[PDB]
Amino acid sequence: RRLKKRIFAAVSEGCVEELVELLVELQELCRRRHDEDVPDFLMHKLTASDTGATCLMKALLNINPNTKEIVRILLAFAEENDILGRFINAEYTEEAYEGQTALNIAIERRQGDIAALLIAAGADVNAHAKGAFFNPKYQHEGFYFGETPLALAACTNQPEIVQLLMEHEQTDITSRDSRGNNILHALVTVAEDFKTQNDFVKRMYDMILLRSGNWELETTRNNDGLTPLQLAAKMGKAEILKYILSREIKEKRLRSLSRKFTDWAYGPVSSSLYDLTNVDTTTDNSVLEITVYNTNIDNRHEMLTLEPLHTLLHMKWKKFAKHMFFLSFCFYFFYNITLTLVSYYRPRGWLQLLGRMFVLIWAMCISVKEGIAIFLLRPSDLQSILSDAWFHFVFFIQAVLVILSVFLYLFAYKEYLACLVLAMALGWANMLYYTRGFQSMGMYSVMIQKVILHDVLKFLFVYIVFLLGFGVALASLIEKCSSYGSFSDAVLELFKLTIGLGDLNIQQNSKYPILFLFLLITYVILTFVLLLNMLIALMGETVENVSKESERIWRLQRARTILEFEKMLPEWLRSRFRMGELRLCLRINEVKWTEWKTHVSF
Amino acid sequence: DGLTPLQLAAKMGKAEILKYILSREIKEKRLRSLSRKFTDWAYGPVSSSLYDLTNVDTTTDNSVLEITVYNTNIDNRHEMLTLEPLHTLLHMKWKKFAKHMFFLSFCFYFFYN
């Protein structure tokens, strides 16, 4: 009741003589045997009852210029009463830091010598700090480091303790923690995608993999089924991905770990074989399909520009995707030409039935294809971000409008013309989707979507309240017997007056003509001059901001087209795999006239 | 005028002296009642700390929050409203009772119009 808090206050600040006198006094209080329990009474007088923290963690959490010898005499006292086997490896009891033993706090607080002192004293290294704070839901709620002391020494940039732990006998390197991660997935989750100056994590990954010297750390999957390569492609870290995909290590006994084998080099020309184990579309979930089909990252073009992704997409294009894209565009052009010629020569016999049937067949095909492609619209993050969720909707709406027009035409209903001309107008406005094949037209097909979604929806969501306010404030003072008779004619007159049409004549059948004229002049100064040109200043800002970022958007849209047309193929006709076994080992060759010249010029 | 050095540095709009005063951690004994932020525990990047709210609230009639928000004679008001314990104080003051009052006021004005 009194010695426990006394020794807990004693261990904190570092009064050594008070500490050793209270430990020998605790030994005398232990000497009078109450014959209840040998270890539980010692734990009750040594560990706190609320948190679970022992005197060792309290010594380590509160470092001071006399912090080593208090741990040494405390371990000597633990060594004295035969308690050290269940004392130096004690964990928390609460479910917050549940598992955080003394070795983790020793490693985290940059105390390497105390860490080696505990590991030489018989500390456990396979401990798992599996508390909920250690594996939180997001990145901002807790410290995720893989809950092992080896990964904690690796992520906090202390390579001394990493070398000190890998040379130990018991420290299993491929130990998978609660999420499934080994040390390499934890190193990937800590790393930073932007090229910062001293990035320790690439060096740590390098030396840990070379110190292990086995393929096993590189290919174990976590609970989501992702290797470190697929995980670094998932999270969007371009530097670790660029290191892993092109890893050239030259000496013998570390050569099966390499992934790029340089075959021959001469000046700037170099031919090299890359490895394509998990970077293809052979398997169901790979680096190409991950780095193209993401939405949760921003540097997708920073990842799609490095080999063997760039040459893989170029070979995949010029082998079989260019002809499939131009063939799809030709079929959609003939479908829209046939729909236009049918809907223009409407009967106000035997020349239309051929001409109606191809339209109906291709409409049923397009509707069921988009029905499948929106049935797989499960993640609902593709809807949030601009990447090609819209065109599935518009193609499906045009197909169902065509088939509804045909089924209303074959019956006695004469409202088929509305559905048919909406189908034809939508079908000719959908041809801008096929302007992603060129380079100078992708910047013109993405601008429409960025400007409609960013600016014009905002300006219309403000302009509707001025339109409604002045519409009822003008229509309600017109005497019933000029043009402003109803609400829904005054709203049309104000819309005509906004876009430069319409008559701003004086004489409407009012009883207050000066008030009517003042409201009309105020509306024209608010929306013809102030609101409209402010919208055009905003649209200029959006178009300027997107036309300096057009080529990234075009490359990403082309890559998504490649992988969609590649998934469209059957299992046969995928006889276009890359290269025979060396492993797949795609052979590429490139010239680097900029790096060779600055490498030589020094 | 009835202003402490904290309220004066908030009045004149000096963000650096304000950032020093509001988060002043001095670690040795005999200079610890002078400190205003007490860091409770730290682990890697996560840190939990207790700040002091003597003159930085709206308990009194003239305080650092009411001064640094209701000024017009300065330009770096957002440079002062982004540092703790002003940022988390405005977030807690929003999500406790001000969001419902703002949306309720908007609904009453919409029905009136």
Side-chain angles (χ1 to χ4, degrees):
Chain A
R1 51 187 188 275
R2 47 166 200 91
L3 194 61
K4 186 172 166 177
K5 314 309 300 304
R6 197 160 302 183
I7 197 55
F8 267 114
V11 66
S12 315
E13 288 86 6
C15 276
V16 196
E17 70 286 327
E18 307 181 18
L19 173 52
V20 59
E21 193 142 322
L22 291 156
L23 297 164
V24 78
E25 276 158 6
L26 182 45
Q27 181 53 244
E28 316 311 322
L29 267 85
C30 168
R31 172 61 167 89
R32 272 82 176 161
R33 294 321 297 158
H34 44 85
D35 58 45
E36 304 278 309
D37 39 29
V38 166
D40 203 350
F41 168 71
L42 273 191
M43 281 297 101
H44 171 230
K45 294 289 115 175
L46 273 156
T47 78
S49 282
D50 213 315
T51 78
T54 81
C55 299
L56 194 49
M57 311 168 195
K58 296 291 181 186
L60 280 163
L61 281 152
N62 187 9
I63 59 172
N64 49 28
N66 41 3
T67 185
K68 201 146 90 177
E69 81 294 339
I70 50 181
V71 184
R72 214 190 296 109
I73 66 187
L74 207 144
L75 285 171
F77 184 80
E79 187 280 335
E80 190 77 290
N81 311 352
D82 192 301
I83 201 52
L84 190 135
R86 60 169 302 145
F87 174 69
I88 206 180
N89 55 6
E91 278 172 45
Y92 272 19
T93 42
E94 55 163 343
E95 279 143 353
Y97 301 173
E98 183 200 14
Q100 178 208 32
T101 188
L103 192 40
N104 289 169
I105 322 168
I107 287 164
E108 205 273 335
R109 295 262 188 247
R110 197 56 60 89
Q111 302 298 134
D113 41 47
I114 316 180
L117 201 151
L118 264 80
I119 295 171
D124 190 279
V125 194
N126 301 45
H128 276 48
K130 51 163 297 298
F133 152 75
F134 283 115
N135 50 17
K137 278 303 308 172
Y138 289 112
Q139 199 90 289
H140 60 84
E141 280 213 356
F143 186 31
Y144 182 66
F145 60 96
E147 54 255 27
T148 71
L150 179 53
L152 187 47
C155 303
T156 50
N157 194 33
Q158 284 159 186
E160 326 292 354
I161 315 175
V162 192
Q163 295 187 56
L164 198 146
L165 268 179
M166 284 189 289
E167 75 163 28
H168 195 260
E169 54 97 340
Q170 195 140 359
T171 75
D172 189 323
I173 308 177
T174 172
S175 303
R176 284 186 42 237
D177 70 80
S178 71
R179 277 199 214 162
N181 299 322
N182 43 32
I183 167 170
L184 294 194
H185 301 79
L187 269 174
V188 162
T189 52
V190 171
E192 177 60 17
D193 49 353
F194 298 101
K195 191 46 164 85
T196 43
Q197 216 290 308
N198 185 217
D199 210 9
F200 63 97
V201 53
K202 178 147 52 179
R203 311 162 51 244
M204 210 73 50
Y205 187 94
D206 204 0
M207 69 162 285
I208 277 154
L209 188 56
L210 291 185
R211 185 71 172 82
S212 159
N214 211 44
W215 259 109
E216 196 53 50
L217 275 193
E218 199 42 71
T219 179
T220 56
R221 313 179 177 253
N222 49 352
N223 260 29
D224 228 317
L226 303 191
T227 43
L229 189 47
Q230 288 150 318
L231 178 68
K234 175 69 69 66
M235 302 198 55
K237 321 219 166 285
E239 284 304 330
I240 305 297
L241 205 76
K242 189 189 181 72
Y243 166 70
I244 292 166
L245 292 183
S246 78
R247 188 170 52 209
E248 166 96 15
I249 38 182
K250 296 269 196 47
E251 56 267 21
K252 190 48 197 105
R253 198 185 49 88
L254 314 166
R255 209 203 78 110
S256 162
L257 298 182
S258 185
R259 282 183 72 101
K260 147 180 164 184
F261 316 114
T262 166
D263 199 9
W264 51 264
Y266 203 57
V269 181
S270 314
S271 171
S272 41
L273 319 190
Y274 286 84
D275 202 333
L276 298 195
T277 47
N278 302 142
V279 195
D280 218 347
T281 299
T282 46
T283 168
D284 50 346
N285 187 22
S286 50
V287 183
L288 190 48
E289 187 201 315
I290 276 165
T291 195
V292 168
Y293 278 162
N294 273 327
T295 42
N296 306 89
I297 41 176
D298 194 270
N299 43 2
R300 271 192 306 273
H301 189 51
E302 204 203 339
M303 304 157 79
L304 275 177
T305 177
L306 49 90
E307 324 271 338
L309 299 163
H310 185 79
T311 180
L312 204 56
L313 284 177
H314 269 82
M315 217 171 305
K316 207 159 286 206
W317 164 263
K318 86 164 55 174
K319 206 66 180 291
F320 77 106
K322 181 185 250 179
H323 312 133
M324 215 178 300
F325 184 70
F326 181 76
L327 190 146
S328 156
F329 160 71
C330 281
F331 278 170
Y332 206 77
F333 194 84
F334 289 153
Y335 159 64
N336 259 328
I337 278 300
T338 304
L339 189 57
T340 287
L341 277 185
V342 166
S343 162
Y344 187 37
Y345 295 151
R346 66 174 188 114
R348 299 288 157 186
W350 206 81
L351 286 66
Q352 190 179 358
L353 293 199
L354 205 163
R356 182 74 84 177
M357 280 318 142
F358 170 56
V359 168
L360 185 50
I361 280 177
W362 207 245
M364 260 178 170
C365 162
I366 280 178
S367 52
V368 77
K369 191 171 307 160
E370 302 309 307
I372 301 305
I374 304 179
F375 172 63
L376 323 174
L377 202 143
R378 293 294 93 195
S380 298
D381 210 342
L382 79 160
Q383 182 57 96
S384 82
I385 289 142
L386 210 70
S387 88
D388 281 333
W390 178 239
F391 282 115
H392 296 125
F393 285 151
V394 193
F395 280 137
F396 184 59
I397 285 165
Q398 199 258 345
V400 67
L401 263 180
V402 162
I403 69 181
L404 192 49
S405 155
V406 172
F407 285 163
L408 283 190
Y409 166 59
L410 270 192
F411 298 157
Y413 298 91
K414 286 329 192 167
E415 203 177 1
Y416 82 111
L417 203 50
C419 293
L420 186 55
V421 304
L422 289 187
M424 180 176 54
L426 205 46
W428 272 116
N430 274 322
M431 303 287 299
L432 308 170
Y433 160 66
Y434 293 101
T435 56
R436 65 191 35 194
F438 309 101
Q439 183 149 352
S440 46
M441 309 297 304
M443 65 104 79
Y444 215 93
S445 173
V446 73
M447 267 176 200
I448 320 289
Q449 284 180 284
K450 280 221 192 292
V451 168
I452 289 292
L453 264 297
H454 276 194
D455 294 4
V456 188
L457 274 190
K458 207 173 297 166
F459 157 74
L460 283 166
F461 197 67
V462 169
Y463 168 83
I464 286 301
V465 81
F466 284 116
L467 196 65
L468 159 70
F470 282 81
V472 194
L474 258 65
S476 90
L477 58 89
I478 294 298
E479 190 57 278
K480 201 87 66 170
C481 196
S482 158
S483 43
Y484 302 86
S486 188
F487 173 63
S488 276
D489 189 306
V491 75
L492 161 74
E493 195 72 36
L494 294 174
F495 179 74
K496 284 207 307 179
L497 204 58
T498 291
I499 58 148
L501 291 173
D503 38 4
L504 188 147
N505 50 352
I506 68 100
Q507 194 48 43
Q508 317 304 108
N509 186 54
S510 154
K511 307 304 198 68
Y512 318 89
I514 301 188
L515 184 84
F516 190 83
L517 185 51
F518 164 64
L519 283 189
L520 211 47
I521 295 307
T522 308
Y523 177 73
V524 161
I525 296 170
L526 284 178
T527 66
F528 192 95
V529 170
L530 158 73
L531 259 175
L532 193 65
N533 308 308
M534 194 191 57
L535 157 79
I536 311 307
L538 286 182
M539 276 174 39
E541 202 183 8
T542 286
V543 165
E544 170 265 351
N545 277 330
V546 71
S547 200
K548 70 177 188 177
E549 202 259 334
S550 91
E551 197 267 336
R552 303 179 194 162
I553 299 287
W554 170 64
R555 286 290 175 84
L556 176 69
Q557 274 166 342
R558 164 178 296 264
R560 185 179 171 91
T561 312
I562 297 293
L563 299 193
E564 264 196 12
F565 281 155
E566 194 211 40
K567 273 160 191 33
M568 204 159 287
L569 287 192
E571 193 40 65
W572 165 68
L573 204 52
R574 289 212 227 176
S575 88
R576 304 187 190 85
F577 71 105
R578 290 303 113 210
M579 190 165 163
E581 287 77 17
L582 181 65
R583 313 295 267 270
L584 273 300
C585 288
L586 177 71
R587 164 181 286 279
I588 80 165
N589 42 36
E590 64 279 347
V591 306
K592 323 174 214 69
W593 199 266
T594 310
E595 300 91 318
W596 168 78
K597 201 174 183 57
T598 72
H599 165 240
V600 159
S601 75
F602 289 142
Chain B
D1 228 317
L3 303 191
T4 43
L6 189 47
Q7 288 150 318
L8 178 68
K11 175 69 69 66
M12 302 198 55
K14 321 219 166 285
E16 284 304 330
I17 305 297
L18 205 76
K19 189 189 181 72
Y20 166 70
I21 292 166
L22 292 183
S23 78
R24 188 170 52 209
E25 167 96 15
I26 38 182
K27 296 269 196 47
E28 56 267 21
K29 190 48 197 105
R30 198 185 49 88
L31 315 166
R32 209 203 78 110
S33 162
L34 298 182
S35 185
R36 282 183 72 101
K37 147 180 164 184
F38 316 114
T39 166
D40 199 9
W41 51 263
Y43 203 57
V46 181
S47 314
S48 171
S49 41
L50 319 190
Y51 286 84
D52 202 333
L53 298 195
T54 47
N55 302 142
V56 195
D57 218 347
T58 299
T59 46
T60 168
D61 50 346
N62 187 22
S63 50
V64 183
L65 190 48
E66 187 201 315
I67 276 165
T68 195
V69 168
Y70 278 162
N71 273 327
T72 42
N73 306 89
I74 41 176
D75 194 270
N76 43 2
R77 271 192 306 273
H78 189 51
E79 204 203 339
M80 304 157 79
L81 274 177
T82 177
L83 48 90
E84 324 271 339
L86 299 163
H87 185 79
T88 180
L89 204 56
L90 284 177
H91 269 82
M92 217 171 305
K93 207 159 286 205
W94 164 263
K95 86 164 55 174
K96 206 66 180 291
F97 77 106
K99 181 185 250 179
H100 312 133
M101 215 178 300
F102 183 70
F103 181 76
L104 190 146
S105 156
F106 160 70
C107 281
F108 278 170
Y109 206 77
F110 194 84
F111 289 153
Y112 159 64
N113 259 329

